[PDB]
Design a protein around this nucleic acid. Structure first.
Ligand code: MG
Ligand code: ZN
Ligand code: ZN
Ligand code: ZN
Lengths: 59, 28, 54, 463, 49, 32, 115, 66, 258, 446, 59, 47, 50
RNA sequence: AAAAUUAGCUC
């Protein structure tokens, strides 16, 4: 359905309003949740107190 | 020419253009 | 079997007899999502056949 | 730029044009910390006390901070944040037309509303969220008051005549998936009506309801514990066929048959059910005023204005002060104005041109109290109400938490296999759990006999 | 076992339904539905009375 | 199209009627 | 699923009485009339008419529960004027009044049409 | 999905007016004038023609045959 | 110790609504008549739909609901027919019901508009509101689809369901000037004058009146189109009179039995 | 047999925090499919009729049925031993209704009085002498309410809006404001009933009724109170709206002036701190004392604004009626709605600097001003600026997180507490012992 | 040993729900953590993450 | 003598499919087909 | 501002100070008492105490 | 008379 007109979408038993962007496995709409994490290649200087170190330069 | 005062209407035309060019789920 | 209530408040409804007894009978109403227990004599068989078959 | 862009969709002009022209720019969160952002262009730059006078950027529109579910909230800034969040979470549970091609989908648990009207007051942001094309609620004449008492602790009173005329009347679909397969060298499944003679394993239910092919035809009445597919597996045959879940009581919409990837007969069947709004159904406005319908009165009983306008919903007044949802009241007022004038009103979060005084002034120009209050009459006796009730249009939703899907009971039902105790879950027809806290409460009461009954007699007697 | 099936079990004759106000009923009453009433039962001993 | 022209006429009218604006229910921040 | 049908609000069930008289014991000459399958429509007017009557010391109806279709009217007259005859007189005069109102309305309509 | 038959609150027939409303809006009239031109006095009945969404068109787009 | 002599006066008589005034009567009687107008008014309506083939895009029940809400003129038929519940026959006899048929199928390319005009009634007088202004849109069909069904209409009253609710909206109002103080305005100046207000534009509300009873009830009965307004009023009065007569007879029988 | 009317069941709500969470009830079957219960019994269960669930168990033995009927029942479980005060009180619209019903300026005609009496399960059948015979028989709300009070109770209470400087001065026994609830022989004489007299509070009227009269008498008291007050609420009517949210156009001037004064004061404080004049307050560093002074200034401003808003209301206002009746709300709520919301603190402090030395990109660095750290200057009626909107959202999120963690921790605490003393009991020797017969107290509670 | 819930069933109960689900995030921090810093709405989430929409349960 | 008529998916053409047969349209050839409305007395009440 | 009757506080204090030493309400304080294995396993350390 | 696992939503 890449750049396909609403005419064809309607004729194919689909609606032009569906956002899309969701896989179909075993006939189920599966969506990937965007996970988040710490940015890589950036120096962080934390000050963990519940330890023996006054400062920690994680990277 | 700058758009004084008459800006509430013009503020949403840019938004409409953006949402037309890029969909809600464009990032996926 | 499909029956029709000919007398009483539910006169006009159509349902399939679910459980029958010697005096009363439970009929599930087609329209409403509820089953009632109406007297057997109030029911009248209408059946649903298919004449032809050729 | 504004002109060339207003003439878009006719020639070719689009967002890329601005981005290339160099008028907008993408700033990421890590760079945003080093730019003197500004809210609105005109207000924060004219000439005043020298605040910064070195702005680098300027936001498009403040309300654009809101998300997807939040944006449909009218006047979000006139409400306390917890209620905004509650509305955001509840919106995803609102019924309506979830997709245009719904009659082709065979998804499980699909709800659809009959008359999904459009909000009388729409924010400028939802125009792109597409809400107006696929709404999820109806504009009802809500009168905030305590008519009888059945709407006192977060509950509402609906109009029986309205429901009869099809107020918030929705439909509930339930799909089913079932296919045959080669269980083993001797084991094999097949669709066929399990007769009373050859099939040993069999249920005490009606089977002739379906046709010879084994698939119940569309448009046939069904009820709980009824056969929907005539699957039989040869050992002579065992009735390994599924039945409609208890307390479903539906009608078959359509029957689909095809071949799965393995090449066996795979069939899907969906059953529809017309869910008339009854008491115990959970409703909610766009402001977090959740509730459950307490009682329903006929039009002859509901109160009425100087003309024949009876409210359709009556929320508890006391829900307003504690929760601080003045946005709901503003919505009601502007909705009255919009209905009278004859066009949808605006409720953008930050507008600087939508106050209560101007709205009231407008409303006063149609023979209505500038604050929206009106004089009702006691539906029973017909004596005016001393207090002037506050009645006006307001957009209400309907959540899927129907009562009939939650009601449950038990009396010596099926038992588990490992520990001989009742099952768990409404679908499996189980019993409720008598938790340790309940045990402690009973001990406090000192009703040792009752405790031992609940734990031994009606749980798992054994010698 | 201890906390799962000895101190907390699952009992029969139980019900769980949504609740609504009803001021016409006394504080000690409870408005049960008809379906749950018909589904549950109470064992009563026969007696000539 | 009628709504667009309605909005534009409303904007120009609001700009025109700039005599006085004395309203109670509205406010804005002013730092420093 | 348990929603009652709509005909149970006005149609009598087999064995139920339309009206039942029950004498009260707390005060002399006081009766509770119980009406089955009715609402405020048929009770409020009777209440007002009884109030109009002077020989009625007390008069008033109630709905034991909105979901239940029943109403109780309590009437208490002077010792020389039984509440049964009080009720009968109230109904009779109310019927006469309604008939007269209907007649006047009809004549007014027939004159309004080209008159 | 389709224009209702009666106003929920009032009960006046409104189903037989959707086409007339669209025609009046098309010719020259505006909403505020067309409603009272059709004869909708009470504001309760006007929400039927202002809020109503017409999805039957999108439904009909999915023609079964031909 | 008797009833009163109410008077009536019509201010506006049309074929769509009636505005009248009742004077010298009790508020209870006024409100009871209003509730009778809305609820207990005999009228004909569709109540038994048999659908044989429905290929439309809407549900099967949706059609029945919309057909249920279509008004049917019953100016002189409702008084003759008898309630189906009290009929003494089987099946919907024409003496106690009216039959309808609908058979449409979209053949041409343009989409059909199945309107109430397609309801071909057997009886001449019991027809939807199209005699003398489009018609109630039922559903829309597309080339290839069809709708075949037949339904029976019977007599009922609004109390059972809204379909039997002839009045669109009743405007009931008494004592336009807040003379009896039954409502207390916090700020009288802020409220608009009632349509029936005789008070001048200077004074906000009439002065209090201790010894004052409610009279001069104003009615604005608005017929949906099924029954004429004055006919609604007459039917309501007759029905209320019948209810009182039945109650009186039952009470007499009870007293005699005791 | 099937469950029939009059049978005893045990209605419960899933989280059973305390004893008053599983009380028996008598069965009543009703058409529609939803559990129902009188509102007064809502407070113990903590239910809310917003889609909640409540279990319902049924015993299967005359022995257990009698046991529950005698030990665990609503009327018997009216007073709790945790605070020796009533648990079931009028805490809904009925409360505001009764408060407005018992004001001095309430009069009812014979029709209304005789209609209200019908909803009385303990009426003796005699019409009381009207408080005003001529020129027309008018009863008084207190006079009618008296018949609701059972037996001969006697108690004294103070209304919510009772001026403290009234007992000392004259008019002690005749209050212009109709306060100082006085009940003798179970007949209301003075004052206006509110939560202080009918709610769940030590010595409340319901408490006295329960202590003097029987539990069934208290039950009938509750039922009659609700059944009469609600029915009169039809004639009275209660509501809320913009008209109840608007000020008088002078209070707005007062609030704006106060806010400007507060802004000027905080700016002066900042100037002094910048120029090194604000000396460190004892026990705190310079920053700490600066923050404390700013917070005190803002709180004083908020309190002044709220007091002005309150004093600018009208008796017909509905927010004020509900707050004084105490049914639902508080003065701070009205203050926030009309006058000003206030400071949006997080973690017991002002909004922090998420970015480098500033709250949000819009504001400039080192901006300790009120609006630049969370002071919401507007009010819910007049909308909120986007920055303060964001800060308000932060505050709400803090509240929600606290609620979630509390719901997670308190359960474990309660479990450990209950498991540490589950066998302690009062033996017939009038002494408290545990399973090991070890004496813990020679007398319960000493 | 891997993460859970990364791919979810698209909740097609209403178009708004579909959009929200297609535009959702999820932090990898353990469920129901004693700490309260990561849950609080941080200032930097201006115009990037809705400050109002969020679940109200343990998450 | 009912051969269990079916309706093609996209052709919307009737087909006669009996047991132990592949599920395909008489023409083109697809793998989807729905059933026809029952012949029973589908009677609703317009309530 | 809440109020709790003094009886309950006294009872909790006595139960925590009955064995002379401060028995913790935790599993490390209640399971040490010679109550009974069937009573300890209910609270905690089910398999261990058994 | 059917398993193990995960997820989502509600008070
Ligand atoms: Mg709740
Ligand atoms: Zn309307
Ligand atoms: Zn007949
Ligand atoms: Zn094929």
């Amino acid at each position: 359905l890449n750049g396909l007109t609403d005419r064809d979408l309607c004729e194919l038993n689909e609606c032009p309003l569906d956002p899309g962007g969701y896989f179909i496995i075993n006939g189920s709409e599966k969506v990937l949740i965007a996970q988040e994490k710490m940015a890589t290649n950036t120096v962080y200087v934390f000050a963990k107190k519940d330890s023996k170190y006054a400062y920690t330069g994680e990277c | 020419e700058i758009t004084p005062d008459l800006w509430q209407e013009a503020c949403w035309i840019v938004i409409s253009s953006y949402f037309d060019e890029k969909g809600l789920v464009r990032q996926q | 079997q499909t029956v029709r209530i000919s007398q009483g408040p539910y006169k006009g409804y159509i349902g399939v007899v679910k459980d029958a007894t010697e005096s009363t009978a439970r009929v599930e109403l087609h329209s409403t999502c509820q089953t009632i227990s109406v007297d057997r004599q109030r029911l009248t068989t209408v059946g649903s056949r298919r004449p032809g078959g050729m | 730029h504004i002109d060339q862009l207003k003439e878009r969709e006719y020639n070719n002009y689009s967002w890329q044009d601005l981005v290339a022209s160099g008028v907008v720019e993408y700033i990421d969160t890590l760079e945003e910390e080093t730019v003197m952002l500004a809210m609105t262009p005109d207000d924060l730059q004219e000439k005043e006390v020298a605040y910064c006078s070195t702005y680098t950027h300027c936001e498009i529109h403040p309300s654009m901070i809101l998300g997807v579910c939040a944006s449909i909230i009218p006047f979000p800034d006139h409400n306390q944040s917890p209620r905004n969040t509650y509305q955001s979470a509840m919106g995803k549970q609102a019924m309506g037309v979830y997709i245009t091609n719904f009659h082709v989908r065979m998804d499980t648990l699909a709800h659809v509303l009959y008359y999904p009207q459009k909000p009388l007051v729409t924010t400028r942001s939802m125009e792109y969220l597409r809400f107006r094309e696929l709404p999820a609620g109806i504009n009802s004449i809500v009168a905030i008051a305590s008519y009888t008492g059945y709407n006192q602790e977060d509950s509402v009173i609906m109009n029986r005549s309205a429901v009869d005329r099809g107020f918030f009347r929705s439909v509930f679909y339930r799909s089913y998936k079932e296919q045959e397969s080669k269980k083993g060298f001797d084991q094999e499944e097949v669709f066929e009506k399990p007769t009373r003679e050859t099939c040993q394993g069999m249920r005490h239910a009606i089977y002739d309801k379906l046709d010879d092919d084994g698939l119940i035809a569309p448009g046939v009445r069904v009820s709980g514990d009824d056969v929907i597919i005539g699957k039989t597996v040869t050992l002579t045959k065992r009735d390994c066929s599924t039945f409609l879940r208890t307390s479903e009581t539906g009608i078959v919409d359509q029957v689909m048959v095809t071949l799965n990837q393995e090449g066996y007969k795979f069939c899907k069947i969906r059953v529809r059910s017309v869910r008339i709004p009854q008491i115990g159904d959970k409703f909610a406005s766009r402001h977090g005023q959740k509730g459950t319908c307490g009682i329903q009165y006929r039009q002859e009983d509901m109160p009425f204005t100087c003309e024949g306008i009876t409210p359709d919903i009556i929320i508890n007044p006391h829900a307003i002060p504690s929760r601080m949802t003045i946005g709901h009241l503003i919505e009601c007022l502007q909705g009255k104005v919009s209905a009278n004038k004859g066009e949808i009103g605006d409720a953008t979060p930050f507008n600087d041109a939508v106050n209560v005084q101007k709205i009231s002034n407008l409303l006063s120009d149609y023979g209505y109290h500038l604050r929206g209050n009106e004089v009702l009459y006691n539906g029973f006796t017909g004596r005016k109400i001393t207090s002037q009730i506050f009645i006006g249009p307001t957009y209400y939703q309907r959540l899927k938490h129907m009562v009939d899907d939650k009601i449950h009971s038990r009396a010596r039902g099926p038992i588990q296999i490992l520990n001989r105790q009742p099952m768990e879950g409404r679908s499996r027809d189980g019993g409720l759990r008598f938790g340790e806290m309940e045990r402690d409460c009973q001990i406090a009461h000192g009703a040792a006999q009752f405790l031992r009954e609940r734990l031994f007699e009606a749980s798992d007697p054994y010698q | 076992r201890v906390r799962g099936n000895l101190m907390g079990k699952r009992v029969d004759f139980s019900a769980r339904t949504v609740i609504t106000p009803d001021p016409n009923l006394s504080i000690d009453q409870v408005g049960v539905p008809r379906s749950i009433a018909a589904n549950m039962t109470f064992a009563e001993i026969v007696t000539p009375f | 199209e009628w709504n667009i022209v309605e909005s534009e006429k409303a904007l120009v009218a609001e700009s025109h009627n700039m005599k006085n604006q004395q309203m109670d229910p509205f406010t804005r921040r002013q730092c420093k | 699923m348990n929603a009652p049908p709509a005909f149970e609000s006005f149609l009598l069930f087999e064995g139920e009485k339309k009206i039942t008289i029950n004498k009260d014991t707390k005060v002399p000459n006081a009766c509770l009339f119980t009406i089955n399958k009715e609402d405020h429509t048929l009770g409020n007017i009777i209440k007002s008419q009884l109030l109009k009557d002077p020989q009625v010391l007390f008069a008033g109806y109630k709905v034991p529960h909105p979901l239940e279709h029943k109403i109780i009217i309590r009437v208490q007259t002077t010792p020389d004027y039984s509440p049964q005859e009080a009720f009968t007189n109230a109904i009779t005069d109310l019927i006469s009044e309604l008939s007269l109102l209907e007649e006047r309305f009809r004549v007014a309509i027939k004159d309004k049409q080209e008159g | 999905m389709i224009i209702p038959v009666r106003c929920f609150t009032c009960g006046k027939i409104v189903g037989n007016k959707w086409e007339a409303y669209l025609g009046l809006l098309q010719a020259e009239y505006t909403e505020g004038d067309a409603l009272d031109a059709l004869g909708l006095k009470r504001y309760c009945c006007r929400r039927m023609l202002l809020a109503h969404v017409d999805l039957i068109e999108k439904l009909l787009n999915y023609a079964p045959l031909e | 110790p008797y009833a009163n002599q109410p008077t009536v006066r019509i201010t506006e008589l049309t074929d769509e609504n009636v505005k009248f005034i009742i004077e010298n009567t009790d508020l209870a009687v006024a409100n009871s008549i209003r509730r009778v107008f809305i609820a207990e008014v005999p009228i004909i309506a569709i109540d038994w739909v048999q659908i044989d083939a429905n290929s439309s895009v809407l549900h099967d029940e949706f059609i029945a609901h919309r057909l249920g809400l279509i008004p049917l003129t019953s100016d002189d038929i409702v008084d003759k027919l008898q309630y189906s519940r009290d009929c003494t026959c089987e099946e919907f006899c024409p003496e106690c019901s009216v039959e309808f048929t609908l058979d449409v199928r979209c053949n041409e390319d343009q989409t059909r508009h199945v309107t109430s005009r397609d309801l071909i009634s057997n009886s001449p007088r019991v027809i939807p509101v199209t005699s003398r202004q489009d018609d109630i849109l039922i559903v829309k069909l597309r080339k290839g689809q069809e709708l075949r069904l037949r339904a029976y209409a019977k007599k009922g009253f609004g109390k059972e369901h809204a379909k039997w609710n002839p009045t669109a909206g009743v405007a009931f109002e008494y004592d336009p000037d807040n003379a009896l103080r039954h409502t207390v305005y916090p700020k009288p100046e802020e409220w608009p004058k009632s349509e029936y207000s005789e008070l001048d534009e200077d004074e906000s509300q009439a002065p209090y009146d201790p010894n004052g009873k409610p009279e001069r009830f104003y009615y604005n009965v608005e017929s949906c189109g099924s029954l004429r307004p004055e006919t609604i009023v007459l039917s309501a009065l007759s029905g209320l009179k019948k209810k009182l007569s039945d109650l009186q007879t039952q009470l007499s029988h009870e007293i005699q039995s005791d | 047999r099937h469950m029939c009317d009059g049978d005893i069941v045990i209605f419960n709500r899933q989280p059973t925090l305390h004893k008053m969470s599983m009380m028996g009830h008598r069965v009543r079957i009703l058409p529609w499919s939803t559990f129902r219960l009188n509102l007064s019994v809502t407070t113990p269960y903590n239910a809310d009729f917003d889609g909640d669930e409540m279990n319902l168990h049924l015993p299967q033995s005359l022995e257990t049925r009698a046991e529950i009927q005698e030990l665990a029942m609503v009327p018997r479980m009216i007073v709790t031993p945790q605070s020796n005060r009533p648990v079931m009180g009028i805490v809904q619209d009925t409360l505001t209704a009764v408060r407005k019903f018992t004001k001095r300026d309430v009069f009812l005609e014979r029709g209304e009085v005789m209609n209200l009496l019908m909803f009385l399960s303990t009426w003796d059948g005699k019409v009381p002498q009207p408080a005003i015979l001529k020129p027309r028989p008018l009863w008084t709300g207190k006079q009618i309410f008296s018949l609701i009070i059972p037996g001969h109770i006697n108690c004294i209470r103070t209304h919510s809006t009772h001026p403290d400087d009234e007992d000392s001065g004259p008019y002690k026994h005749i209050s212009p404001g109709d306060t100082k609830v006085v009940v003798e022989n179970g007949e209301l004489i003075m004052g206006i009933l509110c939560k202080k007299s009918l709610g769940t509070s030590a010595g409340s009227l319901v408490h006295i009724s329960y202590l003097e009269m029987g539990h069934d008498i208290t039950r009938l008291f509750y039922s009659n109170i609700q059944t009469v007050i609600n029915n009169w609420l039809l004639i009275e009517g209660h509501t809320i709206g913009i008209g109840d949210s608007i000020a008088d156009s002078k209070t707005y001037q007062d609030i704006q002036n106060t806010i400007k004064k507060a802004k000027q004061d905080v700016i002066e404080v900042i100037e002094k701190a910048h120029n090194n004049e604000l000396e460190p307050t004892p026990g705190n560093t310079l920053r700490q004392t600066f923050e404390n002074q700013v917070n005190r200034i803002l709180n004083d401003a908020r309190d002044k604004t709220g007091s002005s808003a309150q004093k600018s209301l009208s008796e017909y206002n509905n927010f004020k009626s509900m707050v004084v009746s105490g049914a639902k709300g508080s003065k701070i709520n009205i203050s926030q709605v009309i006058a000003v919301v206030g400071q949006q603190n997080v973690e017991g402090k002002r909004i922090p600097f998420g970015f480098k030395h500033r709250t949000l990109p819009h504001f400039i660095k080192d901006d300790y001003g009120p609006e630049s750290r969370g002071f919401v200057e507007n009010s819910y009626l007049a909308g909120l600026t986007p920055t303060e909107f964001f800060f308000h959202a932060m505050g709400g999120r803090e509240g929600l997180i606290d609620t979630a963690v509390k719901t997670a921790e308190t359960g474990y605490i309660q479990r450990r507490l209950i498991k540490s003393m589950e066998s302690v009991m009062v033996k017939y020797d009038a002494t408290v012992r545990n399973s090991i017969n070890q004496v813990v107290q020679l007398r319960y509670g000493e | 040993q891997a993460r859970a819930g990364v791919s979810q069933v698209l909740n097609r109960l209403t178009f708004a729900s579909t959009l929200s689900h297609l535009r959702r995030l999820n932090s990898p921090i353990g469920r129901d953590g004693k700490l309260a810093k990561p849950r609080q709405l941080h200032n930097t989430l201006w115009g990037m993450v809705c400050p109002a929409e969020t679940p109200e349960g343990h998450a | 003598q009912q051969p269990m008529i079916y309706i093609c998916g996209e052709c919307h053409t009737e087909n006669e499919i009996k047991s132990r047969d592949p599920i395909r349209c008489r023409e083109c050839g697809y793998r989807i087909m729905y059933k026809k409305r029952t012949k029973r007395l589908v009677v609703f009440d317009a309530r | 501002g809440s109020y709790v009757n003094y009886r309950h506080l006294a009872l909790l204090c006595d139960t925590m100070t009955c064995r002379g030493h401060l028995m913790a309400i935790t599993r490390h304080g209640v399971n040490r008492q010679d109550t009974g294995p069937l009573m300890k396993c209910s609270f905690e350390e089910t398999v261990d105490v058994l």
